[PDB]
Amino acid sequence: TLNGGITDMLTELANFEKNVSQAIHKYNAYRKAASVIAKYPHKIKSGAEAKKLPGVGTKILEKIDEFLATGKLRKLEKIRQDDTSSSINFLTRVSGIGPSAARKFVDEGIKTLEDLRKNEDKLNHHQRIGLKYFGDFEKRIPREEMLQMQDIVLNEVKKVDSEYIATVCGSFRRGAESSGDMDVLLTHPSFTSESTKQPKLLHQVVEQLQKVHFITDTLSKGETKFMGVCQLPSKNDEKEYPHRRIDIRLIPKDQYYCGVLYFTGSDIFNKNMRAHALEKGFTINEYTIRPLGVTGVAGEPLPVDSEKDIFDYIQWKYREPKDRSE
DNA sequence: CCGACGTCGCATCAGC
DNA sequence: GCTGATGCGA
DNA sequence: GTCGG
Ligand SMILES: Nc1ccn([C@H]2C[C@H](O)[C@H](COP(=O)(O)OP(=O)(O)C(Cl)(Cl)P(=O)(O)O)O2)c(=O)n1
Ligand SMILES: Nc1ccn([C@H]2C[C@H](O)[C@@H](COP(=O)(O)O)O2)c(=O)n1
Ligand SMILES: [Cl-]
Ligand SMILES: [Mg+2]
Ligand SMILES: [Mg+2]
Ligand code: NA
Ligand code: NA
Ligand code: NA
């Protein structure tokens, strides 16, 4: 990409602040700057030119000038040399190992893939499955494979109850030619904002996907959110497909548009859009958009009959899913 | 300057 | 057990 | 780290 060197540098800084410094707001600010630069349609010539973009301030502009002049960033060259930072950044690549667990593991002398495998009993269930599929989860999913996965999920869900509707969201819905995982929004008319007329609505879909050996492992599961592992079937004598991460979110059927807005993302697009709502005097979540009173307290949900109604309230022109890849 | 920064589900743990 | 952080994830 | 009042 046009400014890939700069955006990679800012992404590495963001990951450092999240994993090592445990500074969540610095992480978000580095990712916001990388995102705005990533869609900037010129090859950046200077820090000053980048500082014109919202989210790029004085410090990033200085780093951009250093990187443009030398091709590298001294602050990052030193981070890469630091063993504790190196170890923490590696351990946090395992699903279920976050910043705190990674620092505790290094304290205990658990620093490598070899160390993790030797100490499975030090791992909670989520972490244990993240270690099991460590290599698989860093592989990307071709859209063609997403389409086969979509076919299985939709057809199995229809076999449980033809009134379910499953919608694949995430980067797939944004039209990406590959995805990092599969995100499935699920609705059923028995589950609305007003009542749950049927129990186990998420459970029985998960069970059916387990029965046909599509879902293979469970990271976490509740009444409305499943987080797990799935795998396409392979043909005779074929090498197996990698195992893939799958998230399934059951959303009240009447709140589908807020739900599909949220689950289509991207994550930065959601942050930007929800920050804009706040400035406009609204709060948006995966269920509702509600006004803010003078006291900063959310009011009653506003009527929503399309994704576009949500954009309208906050005075944004509508953006198709393919233009939300921030 | 400096307060705010998106919002929430599930797993885990501490205190009662 | 309940409740309210806190961790990690979407 | 950046922004807006
Ligand atoms: N911090 C987050 C993370 C995710 N999300 C939402 C938006 C996003 O699209 C998400 C699905 O999570 P994801 O991590 O799978 O994000 P994707 O957009 O699908 C993706 Cl580009 Cl990271 P990938 O999964 O295709 O690699 O749910 C969010 O709102 N806030
Ligand atoms: N998972 C889904 C997807 C769509 N829908 C509903 C919302 C609208 O009434 C209708 C529109 O479908 P679509 O947005 O796919 O054009 O389907 C649902 O209830 N659950
Ligand atoms: Cl709500
Ligand atoms: Mg995804
Ligand atoms: Mg602000
Ligand atoms: Na700027
Ligand atoms: Na992790
Ligand atoms: Na996901």
Coordinates of all heavy atoms in Angstrom, one line a residue, chain A residues 42-43 65 100 141 244:
Chain A
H42 N -2.6 9.7 -1.0 CA -1.3 10.2 -1.4 C -0.1 9.5 -0.7 O -0.3 9.1 0.5 CB -1.1 11.7 -1.2 CG -2.2 12.6 -1.9 ND1 -2.1 12.9 -3.2 CD2 -3.3 13.1 -1.3 CE1 -3.2 13.7 -3.5 NE2 -3.9 13.8 -2.4
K43 N 1.0 9.4 -1.4 CA 2.2 8.9 -0.7 C 2.8 10.1 0.2 O 3.1 11.1 -0.3 CB 3.3 8.5 -1.7 CG 4.6 8.0 -1.0 CD 5.4 7.2 -2.0 CE 6.9 7.6 -1.9 NZ 7.7 6.8 -2.8
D65 N 8.6 11.6 10.2 CA 9.8 12.2 9.7 C 11.0 11.4 9.9 O 11.8 11.2 9.0 CB 10.0 13.6 10.2 CG 9.1 14.7 9.6 OD1 8.8 14.5 8.4 OD2 8.8 15.7 10.3
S100 N -1.8 -9.0 30.8 CA -1.5 -9.4 32.2 C -1.0 -10.8 32.2 O 0.0 -11.1 32.9 CB -2.7 -9.2 33.0 OG -2.5 -9.6 34.4
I141 N -8.2 -16.7 5.7 CA -9.2 -17.6 5.1 C -9.5 -17.0 3.7 O -10.0 -15.8 3.6 CB -10.5 -17.7 5.9 CG1 -10.1 -18.2 7.3 CG2 -11.5 -18.6 5.3 CD1 -11.3 -18.0 8.3
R244 N -10.3 -22.9 12.1 CA -10.6 -21.4 12.0 C -11.3 -21.0 13.2 O -12.1 -21.7 13.8 CB -11.4 -21.1 10.7 CG -11.0 -21.8 9.4 CD -9.6 -21.2 9.0 NE -9.3 -21.5 7.5 CZ -8.2 -21.1 6.9 NH1 -7.3 -20.5 7.7 NH2 -8.0 -21.4 5.7

